[PDB]
Amino acid sequence: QTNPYARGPNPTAASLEASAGPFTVRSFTVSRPSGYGAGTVYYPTNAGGTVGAIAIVPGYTARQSSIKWWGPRLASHGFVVITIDTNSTLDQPSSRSSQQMAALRQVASLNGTSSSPIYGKVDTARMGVMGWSMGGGGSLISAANNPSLKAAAPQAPWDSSTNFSSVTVPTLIFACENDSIAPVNSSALPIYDSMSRNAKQFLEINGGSHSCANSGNSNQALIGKKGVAWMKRFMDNDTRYSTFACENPNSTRVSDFRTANCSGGGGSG
């Protein structure tokens, strides 16, 4: 059967590493944010069907600028993306998760609002979560509390607990080798190791500082390829992306790679 959620052309490494995918992207700022501080919605104008929605949250003290690059990068491959500012820059992870879910709720509401640029563009049954540091911890909390989410891809995550063993959502963890804010061996890696009930992946950027996956980073080719491939594979069920999502990228830019329960296009063996 034709996968009803497949969008865009067959992927190549070059097309996933480029700065933009196939679709034209527009954006708007949310007029009256509902349950969070502010939001920018990125969306494809011509995806060829409804697409899933992804909500992205920054870390402590941080604002949309730190995570903004994901907006165009994901939306140009066929997603509606909302980046947010939290009610307070000093909100903790559980609050960030609530606000993340409120942003997804509002994307669904705008999909139903005839005046909105994303009217009828969203499949509100297919949602994902991303975010940086405390916003990454908030993404994992969102996944733990809302298992119908289709994918999570936090970056340099931190939470006051590293035990995310209840998560059944496919989760890709971006980590930064030299992170001194949320050190990998006390945060991102114990988080990754705690999850035994899901498809999961761990991708650590060689020499990365705590901001190694943020706007302006020097690995947008690899990080953007992996984020889009993960979201395509698991939010769209798009098996064209099974290998890009699950495979070791064999990159000089990677200082650790792990994956579990990720079938990468090799049959049953």
Numbering used by the authors: 1 to 269
What do the study authors state?
In 2016, a research group from Keio University identified a novel PET-hydrolyzing enzyme named PETase from the bacterium Ideonella sakaiensis 201-F614. One of the most important characteristics of PETase is its ability to degrade hcPET at a low temperature (30 °C); due to this property, PETase is a promising candidate for a practical method of recycling PET. For PETase, the portion circled in the structure is the active site, which is much broader than those of the other PET hydrolases; this active site may explain why PETase can accommodate a large substrate, such as PET, at moderate temperatures. The enzymatic degradation of PET is a two-step process in which the enzyme binds to the polymer substrate and subsequently catalyzes hydrolytic cleavage.
A flexible linker (GGGGSGGGGS) was employed to link the corresponding anchoring protein with PETase and HFBI separately to prevent interference from occuring between each anchoring protein and its displaying target. To explore the structural difference between wild-type PETase and linker-attached PETase, the crystal structures of those two proteins were determined at 2.0 Å and 1.5 Å, respectively. In the structure of linker-attached PETase, we can only see a part of the linker (6 amino acids) in the form of an irregular structure, indicating that the (GGGGS)2 linker is flexible. The two active-site pockets were almost identical. The above results revealed that the C-terminal fused linker did not induce obvious structural changes in PETase. In the simulation, the (GGGGS)2 linker showed high flexibility, and no unique structure was observed when the linker-attached PETase was displayed by the yeast cell-wall protein GCW51. Moreover, this flexible linker separated PETase from GCW51 in space, meaning that the two functional units did not affect each other.
